[PDB]
Design an enzyme around this catalytic site. Structure first.
Site, PDB file in Angstrom:
ATOM      1  N   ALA A  82      -1.065 -10.030   3.869  1.00  0.00           N
ATOM      2  CA  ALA A  82       0.183 -10.349   4.480  1.00  0.00           C
ATOM      3  C   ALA A  82       0.050 -10.268   5.576  1.00  0.00           C
ATOM      4  O   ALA A  82       0.673 -10.871   6.571  1.00  0.00           O
ATOM      5  CB  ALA A  82       2.287 -10.018   4.132  1.00  0.00           C
ATOM      6  N   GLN A 109       0.733  -1.582   0.127  1.00  0.00           N
ATOM      7  CA  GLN A 109       0.119   0.195  -0.087  1.00  0.00           C
ATOM      8  C   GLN A 109       0.761   1.207   0.335  1.00  0.00           C
ATOM      9  O   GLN A 109       1.006   2.166  -0.548  1.00  0.00           O
ATOM     10  CB  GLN A 109      -0.549   0.401   0.957  1.00  0.00           C
ATOM     11  CG  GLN A 109      -1.224   1.462   1.610  1.00  0.00           C
ATOM     12  CD  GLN A 109      -3.080   1.391   2.797  1.00  0.00           C
ATOM     13  OE1 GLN A 109      -3.473   0.362   2.795  1.00  0.00           O
ATOM     14  NE2 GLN A 109      -2.574   2.597   3.191  1.00  0.00           N
ATOM     15  N   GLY A 131       5.084  -2.812   6.838  1.00  0.00           N
ATOM     16  CA  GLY A 131       4.057  -3.952   6.045  1.00  0.00           C
ATOM     17  C   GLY A 131       4.368  -5.198   5.456  1.00  0.00           C
ATOM     18  O   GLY A 131       5.231  -5.519   5.992  1.00  0.00           O
ATOM     19  N   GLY A 132       3.058  -6.531   6.036  1.00  0.00           N
ATOM     20  CA  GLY A 132       3.667  -7.281   6.113  1.00  0.00           C
ATOM     21  C   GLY A 132       4.467  -7.856   4.297  1.00  0.00           C
ATOM     22  O   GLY A 132       4.827  -8.501   3.958  1.00  0.00           O
ATOM     23  N   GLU A 180      26.261   6.139 -10.081  1.00  0.00           N
ATOM     24  CA  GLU A 180      27.250   6.332  -9.455  1.00  0.00           C
ATOM     25  C   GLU A 180      26.148   7.417  -8.304  1.00  0.00           C
ATOM     26  O   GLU A 180      26.714   7.981  -8.031  1.00  0.00           O
ATOM     27  CB  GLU A 180      26.470   8.206 -10.829  1.00  0.00           C
ATOM     28  CG  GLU A 180      27.385   9.651 -10.210  1.00  0.00           C
ATOM     29  CD  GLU A 180      27.333  10.604 -11.518  1.00  0.00           C
ATOM     30  OE1 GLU A 180      26.785  10.427 -12.636  1.00  0.00           O
ATOM     31  OE2 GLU A 180      27.259  11.423 -11.690  1.00  0.00           O
ATOM     32  N   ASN A 191       7.995   8.543   8.575  1.00  0.00           N
ATOM     33  CA  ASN A 191       6.791   9.221   8.101  1.00  0.00           C
ATOM     34  C   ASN A 191       6.909  10.057   9.404  1.00  0.00           C
ATOM     35  O   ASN A 191       5.358  11.028   9.266  1.00  0.00           O
ATOM     36  CB  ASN A 191       6.566   7.841   9.001  1.00  0.00           C
ATOM     37  CG  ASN A 191       4.884   8.037   6.883  1.00  0.00           C
ATOM     38  OD1 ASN A 191       5.683   8.082   6.313  1.00  0.00           O
ATOM     39  ND2 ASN A 191       4.645   6.853   7.275  1.00  0.00           N
ATOM     40  N   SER A 209       6.850  -0.100   2.296  1.00  0.00           N
ATOM     41  CA  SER A 209       7.667   0.133   3.642  1.00  0.00           C
ATOM     42  C   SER A 209       8.279  -0.630   3.728  1.00  0.00           C
ATOM     43  O   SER A 209       7.996  -1.661   3.327  1.00  0.00           O
ATOM     44  CB  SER A 209       5.924   0.092   4.087  1.00  0.00           C
ATOM     45  OG  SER A 209       5.014  -0.983   4.350  1.00  0.00           O
ATOM     46  N   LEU A 239      21.809   5.085 -11.885  1.00  0.00           N
ATOM     47  CA  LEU A 239      22.234   4.615 -11.234  1.00  0.00           C
ATOM     48  C   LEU A 239      23.363   4.159 -10.111  1.00  0.00           C
ATOM     49  O   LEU A 239      23.787   3.851  -9.019  1.00  0.00           O
ATOM     50  CB  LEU A 239      21.189   2.794 -10.476  1.00  0.00           C
ATOM     51  CG  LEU A 239      19.947   3.464 -11.004  1.00  0.00           C
ATOM     52  CD1 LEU A 239      19.123   2.136 -11.443  1.00  0.00           C
ATOM     53  CD2 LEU A 239      19.407   5.029 -10.178  1.00  0.00           C
TER      54      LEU A 239
HETATM   55  N1  LIG Z   1       4.448   7.442   3.397  1.00  0.00           N
HETATM   56  C1  LIG Z   1       3.028   6.623   3.615  1.00  0.00           C
HETATM   57  N2  LIG Z   1       3.055   5.645   4.598  1.00  0.00           N
HETATM   58  C2  LIG Z   1       2.349   4.493   4.499  1.00  0.00           C
HETATM   59  C3  LIG Z   1       1.888   5.265   3.184  1.00  0.00           C
HETATM   60  N3  LIG Z   1       0.644   4.211   3.417  1.00  0.00           N
HETATM   61  C4  LIG Z   1       0.664   2.768   4.344  1.00  0.00           C
HETATM   62  N4  LIG Z   1       1.926   3.895   4.804  1.00  0.00           N
HETATM   63  C5  LIG Z   1       2.547   2.887   5.629  1.00  0.00           C
HETATM   64  O1  LIG Z   1       3.260   1.632   5.587  1.00  0.00           O
HETATM   65  C6  LIG Z   1       3.083   1.037   7.293  1.00  0.00           C
HETATM   66  C7  LIG Z   1       2.848  -0.144   6.570  1.00  0.00           C
HETATM   67  O2  LIG Z   1       1.833  -0.507   5.429  1.00  0.00           O
HETATM   68  P1  LIG Z   1       1.754  -0.623   4.246  1.00  0.00           P
HETATM   69  O3  LIG Z   1       2.511  -0.779   3.096  1.00  0.00           O
HETATM   70  O4  LIG Z   1      -0.093  -0.144   3.998  1.00  0.00           O
HETATM   71  O5  LIG Z   1       1.337  -2.051   4.675  1.00  0.00           O
HETATM   72  P2  LIG Z   1       1.288  -3.143   2.679  1.00  0.00           P
HETATM   73  O6  LIG Z   1       2.522  -3.007   2.405  1.00  0.00           O
HETATM   74  O7  LIG Z   1      -0.317  -3.403   2.439  1.00  0.00           O
HETATM   75  O8  LIG Z   1       1.307  -4.902   3.923  1.00  0.00           O
HETATM   76  P3  LIG Z   1      -0.019  -4.938   4.146  1.00  0.00           P
HETATM   77  O9  LIG Z   1      -1.394  -4.713   4.504  1.00  0.00           O
HETATM   78  O10 LIG Z   1       0.033  -6.070   6.243  1.00  0.00           O
HETATM   79  O11 LIG Z   1      -0.690  -6.512   3.865  1.00  0.00           O
HETATM   80  C8  LIG Z   1       2.376   1.562   8.097  1.00  0.00           C
HETATM   81  O12 LIG Z   1       2.628   2.428   9.183  1.00  0.00           O
HETATM   82  C9  LIG Z   1       1.461   3.316   7.669  1.00  0.00           C
HETATM   83  O13 LIG Z   1       2.054   4.007   7.764  1.00  0.00           O
HETATM   84  C10 LIG Z   1       1.551   5.822   2.138  1.00  0.00           C
HETATM   85  O14 LIG Z   1       0.719   6.313   1.118  1.00  0.00           O
HETATM   86  N5  LIG Z   1       2.226   6.805   2.868  1.00  0.00           N
HETATM   87 MG   LIG Z   2      -1.786  -3.992   2.520  1.00  0.00          MG
END
Ligand SMILES: Nc1nc2c(ncn2[C@@H]2O[C@H](COP(=O)(O)OP(=O)(O)OP(=O)(O)O)[C@@H](O)[C@H]2O)c(=O)[nH]1
Ligand SMILES: [Mg+2]
Ligand SMILES: Nc1nc2c(ncn2[C@@H]2O[C@H](COP(=O)(O)OP(=O)(O)OP(=O)(O)O)[C@@H](O)[C@H]2O)c(=O)[nH]1
Ligand SMILES: [Mg+2]
Lengths: 155, 431, 424
Positions: free
Chosen positions: B98, B10, B142-143, B253, B205, B139, B251
């Site tokens: 995940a 995400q 995230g899983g 560099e 973040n 991220s 890349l």
């Molecule tokens: N800066 C920013 N951080 C984000 C965003 N979306 C999610 N996060 C951060 O990413 C971290 C993990 O969330 P996700 O990346 O959504 O997790 P995922 O990769 O989808 O993995 P799963 O949902 O567990 O399958 C969290 O701490 C959120 O704060 C975004 O659009 N912008």
């Molecule tokens: Mg997700």
């Protein structure tokens, strides 16, 4: 053996069969393997009429089993108000302590039989009696957070 | 010449969205892919063609793959303002995510889609004549962003052994955190990606959050706010690749200019100026680069040593003013380099005014700057994560979720021990 | 992660289940016919989670339950093929539900379950409402759970389990049934909402000033809880949005998955809730024992993890501030070795009758107070061996009582262990 039969009849609740057994000379104070009398069994399973008959025919109201349980302990635990009263009327030891240090008041309190608690109290139930762990009935009402019981324990 | 962007999970997908929108705006590319300025190839050897391919219909298509183990976030992409910008084969989704579990992303769930993803990447690599490598957005917490990214990075180091892989990693903050076990995922992914990544730009973040509240006056920053700011800085970093500059033109560099020490490949990025929609000189914006409040990662570079320092200007910027501003800073503040590093700054200028997204929270400015610096102070960011990790792991809290998903418990210790060594690495440099 | 299969067993399970469906149907704009007459895109966004028609399965060894169900307001909306009813009724015998009459009817239920599972695009898992004090909901309920746990090992098992109290039902074998059930729950569910009848009564009697609480009064509280705790599952959101993400955030140790639910404000049936609560008030109710649906005091233990759901029009800024406030000002009540263990979600759509509300899902060590209560009663009864032949006469052995008792005492000790645990 008519003693074993009286035990089963008092437990099952066959009022007539109890009468018939006692009509052939059945031992009213017979015991099972654990020392339970017909009175213990009738008082446990809520058989009032049988309890009354037994008491009117030479039953030891304060008979204890192998674990020190009196009929009053068991009636109080299971919550038979009628029987608790009848027992006390026939001279039941309201402050009997079994092997676990529990009194009838302890068991009535634990199972939340509040009316029985009140009856026991009015018959001189020792509010200061402690079990093995050192806990009284009031301690139980406090530890379990039972305000209704704590109220009746101080009336 | 060509670079391929891979957006995972995400965070990576939504930040990808913001980046590509911004890219299209900077290059005069419409949401339907048309560019009223370029000619059909041609004519496939332009600067921006490093990021966009060209259809025989004149359509300019992002060299990008979007991957998520759940369709919701990517479904918004194929049903949005830029639905026609991507071919649908570039947008890959599964059904079960995940669930904030690294082990599911890397082992149980991720193994079921890794070949499909590698194949969709192969198609893009097939459209390339001189692939440099990959820019990977994801991220830490995230899983999918953790587990699948590390898995993909391993496989990419296998299938494309001799090419650069750069990261844009979203470092977790409690303000927008959605999982308690995010410290676990961060450490796990940092461990298994370390030997596969050439250069990684961490985005804290909390830093972005603070900058939105302070400099944009946004009370409760949303992902859209954060992502538009993150997008602006990613743009500042990749500009040299899209505009044929003189600094960081490929890349390789990036590693050469920022990473003199392979394991220590985490440049701190500092951006200025960030102004709300309610003119700073070269000297003023350059000075702001050494203000920790403007960093994308929360740490104190005053308590650290520099290994490398790049300044990336864009806008109405005169070189003489840059050097003057540098000479001031290089002799006004307290900038300490390691004895085994030149000490001089590397300067790149892009003479186009910075672009902003219409309806954004950022003011259009005449000149901006992004400083990329490799400082040992960023070790603080690792320390904080490691502290949270150690608190939970001491009780083995939430470890059963990972063990029950194709992961060995020992992989926790190994990962943490690698992090311990990484901290030692930073310690040995800053002394 | 889309569809959840709902199952309701026994009298209590069917009552609180019906209430659940009544409440969430009103929230999602669904009428007793199944037609949508709502006025918000947010209502239908995740309608496929609980609806196909309610994805519910209705079970009881007591046939009469059928009538009470379909004679309910929303009783017509249930698929007639998802009614699996026996002809007898266990009569508060866990063994009859577990080994005897329930074991005979269980496969019939599993067929209906499987039938619903097949037409699921992405099955999340299962949701069972039941009581632990009876024979069907407790005994047969825990059987179903094991059978589903073995058929669907990769899906989440979730229960709403109501705890027997002598203040509601004066049946002395309920501590037996509850202990035997908890023995199954600790091993076979991923997450369990402990709905204590002791707490529901106490709340109705002493707070809401009802001299004689009925089941309707207790179920008003249960329903408000149930809509509160499933809010994040039923509406578009980023936190605890599915059964697995919730469990991952909520359950640090597998056996410790029993939640103390709470919510504010505490309303009465038909009453006129005026002057809605402010954000700071709702926030502070998190540590209020009077707001807990489990008869335990949060101040008597430590929180391992918490989920806080705020519903209605309010400032996310003020909510963020108040949640931070309540944490740092009460930090010793939150376990140090789980950093950032409280997650907060804000939904724009408030429950019916209220303008703003908060629901709290706590994994607290204080929940041992509940288990300590049951165990004490179980031990009081078990030591005198009363009514044991009811259970052995159905196939059980006295050893199962001992094993269950022992396991529950282990659970209590484990809660105690982590309550005393230090980060150092
Ligand atoms: N800066 C920013 N951080 C984000 C965003 N979306 C999610 N996060 C951060 O990413 C971290 C993990 O969330 P996700 O990346 O959504 O997790 P995922 O990769 O989808 O993995 P799963 O949902 O567990 O399958 C969290 O701490 C959120 O704060 C975004 O659009 N912008
Ligand atoms: Mg997700
Ligand atoms: N809160 C609440 N508790 C209930 C309700 N109905 C029953 N109970 C409780 O449930 C416990 C046992 O009843 P049930 O579980 O419904 O019995 P059953 O599952 O149908 O099993 P059998 O009676 O053997 O057929 C008792 O402790 C009751 O107090 C209800 O509507 N609300
Ligand atoms: Mg029933």
């Amino acid at each position: 053996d008519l003693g074993k039969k009286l035990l089963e009849a008092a437990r099952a609740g066959q009022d007539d069969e109890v009468r018939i057994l006692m009509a052939n000379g059945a031992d009213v104070n017979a015991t099972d393997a654990s020392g339970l009398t017909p009175l213990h069994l009738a008082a446990t399973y809520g058989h009032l009429e049988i309890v009354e008959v037994l008491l009117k025919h030479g039953a030891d109201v304060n008979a204890i089993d192998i674990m020190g349980s009196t009929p009053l302990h068991l009636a109080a635990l299971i919550g038979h108000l009628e029987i608790v009263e009848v027992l006390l009327k026939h001279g039941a030891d309201v402050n009997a302590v079994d092997t676990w240090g529990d009194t009838p008041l302890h068991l009535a309190a634990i199972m939340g039989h509040l009316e029985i608690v009140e009856v026991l109290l009015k018959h001189g139930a020792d509010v200061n009696a402690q079990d093995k762990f050192g806990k009284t009935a009031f301690d139980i009402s406090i530890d379990n957070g039972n305000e209704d019981l704590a109220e009746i324990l101080q009336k | 010449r060509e670079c391929i962007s891979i957006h995972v999970g995400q965070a990576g997908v939504q930040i990808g969205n913001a980046c590509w929108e911004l890219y299209c705006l900077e290059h005069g590319i419409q949401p339907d892919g048309q560019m009223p300025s370029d000619k059909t190839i041609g004519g496939g050897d332009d600067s921006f063609n490093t990021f966009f391919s060209e259809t025989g219909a004149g359509k300019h298509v992002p060299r990008a793959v979007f991957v998520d183990l759940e369709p919701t976030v990517i479904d918004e992409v194929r049903t949005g303002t830029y639905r026609q910008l991507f071919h649908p084969e570039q947008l890959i989704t599964g059904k079960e995510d995940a669930a904030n579990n690294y082990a599911r992303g890397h082992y149980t769930i991720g193994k079921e889609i890794i070949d499909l993803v590698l194949d969709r990447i192969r198609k893009l690599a097939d459209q390339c004549t001189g692939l440099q490598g990959f820019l990977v957005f994801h991220s830490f917490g995230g899983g999918t962003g953790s587990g699948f990214t590390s898995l993909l990075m391993e496989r990419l180091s296998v299938d494309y052994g001799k090419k650069s892989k750069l990261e844009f990693s979203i470092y977790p903050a409690p303000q927008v955190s959605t999982a308690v076990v995010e410290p676990y995922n961060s450490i796990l992914t940092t461990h298994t990606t370390l030997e596969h990544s050439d250069c990684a730009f961490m985005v804290d973040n909390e830093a972005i959050y603070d900058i939105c509240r302070r400099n944009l006056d946004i009370e409760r920053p949303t992902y859209t706010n954060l992502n538009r700011l993150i997008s602006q800085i990613v743009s500042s970093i990749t500009a040299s690749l899209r505009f044929d500059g003189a600094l960081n033109v490929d890349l390789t560099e990036f590693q050469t200019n920022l990473v003199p020490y392979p394991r220590i490949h985490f440049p701190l990025a500092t951006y200025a100026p960030v102004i709300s929609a309610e003119q700073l000189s070269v000297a003023e914006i350059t000075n702001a680069c050494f203000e920790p409040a403007n960093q994308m990662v929360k740490c104190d570079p005053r308590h650290g040593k520099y290994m490398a320092c790049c300044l990336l200007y864009r806008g109405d910027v005169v070189p003489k003013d840059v050097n003057a501003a540098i000479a001031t800073i290089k002799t006004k503040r307290s900038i300490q380099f390691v004895d085994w590093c030149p000490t001089g700054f590397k300067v790149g200028i892009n003479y186009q005014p910075p672009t902003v997204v219409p309806g954004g929270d950022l003011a259009k400015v005449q000149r901006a700057v992004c400083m990329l610096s490799n400082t040992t102070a960023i070790a603080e960011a690792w320390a904080r994560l490691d502290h949270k990790f150690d608190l939970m792991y001491a009780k083995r809290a939430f470890v059963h979720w990972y063990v029950g998903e194709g992961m060995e418990e020992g992989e926790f210790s190994e990962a943490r021990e690698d992090m311990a060594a990484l901290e030692k690495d930073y310690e040995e440099v800053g002394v | 992660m889309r569809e959840i299969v709902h199952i309701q067993a026994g009298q209590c399970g069917n009552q609180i289940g019906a209430k659940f469906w009544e409440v969430i149907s009103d929230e999602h704009g669904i009428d007793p016919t199944g037609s949508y007459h709502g006025d918000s895109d947010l209502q239908l966004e995740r309608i496929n989670v609980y609806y196909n028609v309610p994805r519910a399965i209705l079970v009881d060894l007591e046939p009469g339950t059928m009538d009470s169900v379909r004679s309910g307001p929303f009783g017509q909306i249930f698929r007639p093929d998802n009614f699996v009813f026996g002809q007898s009724g266990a009569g508060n015998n866990w063994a009859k539900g577990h080994y005897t009459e329930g074991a005979e009817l269980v496969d019939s239920v599993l067929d209906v379950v499987r039938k619903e599972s097949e037409s699921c695009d992405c099955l999340q898992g299962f949701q069972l409402t039941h009581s632990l004090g009876g024979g069907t909901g407790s005994g047969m309920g825990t059987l179903l759970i094991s059978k589903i746990r073995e058929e669907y090992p990769d899906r989440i098992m979730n229960t709403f389990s109501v705890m027997p109290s002598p203040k509601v039902s004066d049946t002395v074998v309920e501590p037996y049934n509850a202990t035997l059930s908890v023995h199954q729950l600790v091993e076979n569910t991923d997450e369990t909402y402990s709905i204590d009848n002791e707490a529901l009564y106490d709340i109705c009697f002493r707070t809401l000033k009802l001299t004689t609480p009925t089941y309707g009064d207790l179920n008003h509280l249960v329903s408000a809880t149930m809509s509160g705790v499933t809010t994040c599952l039923r509406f578009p959101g980023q936190l605890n949005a599915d059964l697995r993400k919730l469990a991952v955030n909520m359950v640090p140790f597998p056996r410790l998955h029993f939640f103390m639910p709470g919510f504010a404000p505490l309303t009465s049936r038909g009453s006129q809730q005026y002057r809605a609560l402010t954000v700071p008030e709702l926030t502070q109710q998190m540590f209020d024992s009077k707001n807990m649906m489990a008869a335990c005091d949060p101040r008597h233990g430590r929180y391992l993890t918490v989920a806080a759901i705020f519903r209605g029009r309010m400032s996310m800024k003020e909510v963020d501030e108040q949640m931070l406030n309540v944490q740092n000002k009460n930090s010793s009540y939150f376990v140090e070795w789980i950093p950032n263990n409280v997650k907060t979600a804000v939904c724009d759509i408030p429950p019916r009758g209220l303008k703003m509300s908060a629901t709290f899902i706590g994994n607290s060590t204080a929940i041992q107070e509940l288990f300590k209560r049951i165990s004490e009663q179980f031990t009081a009864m078990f030591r005198r061996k009363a009514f044991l032949h009811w259970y052995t006469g159905e196939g059980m052995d006295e050893m199962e009582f001992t094993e269950a008792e022992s396991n529950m005492n282990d659970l209590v000790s484990e809660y105690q262990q982590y309550q005393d645990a230090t980060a150092d």
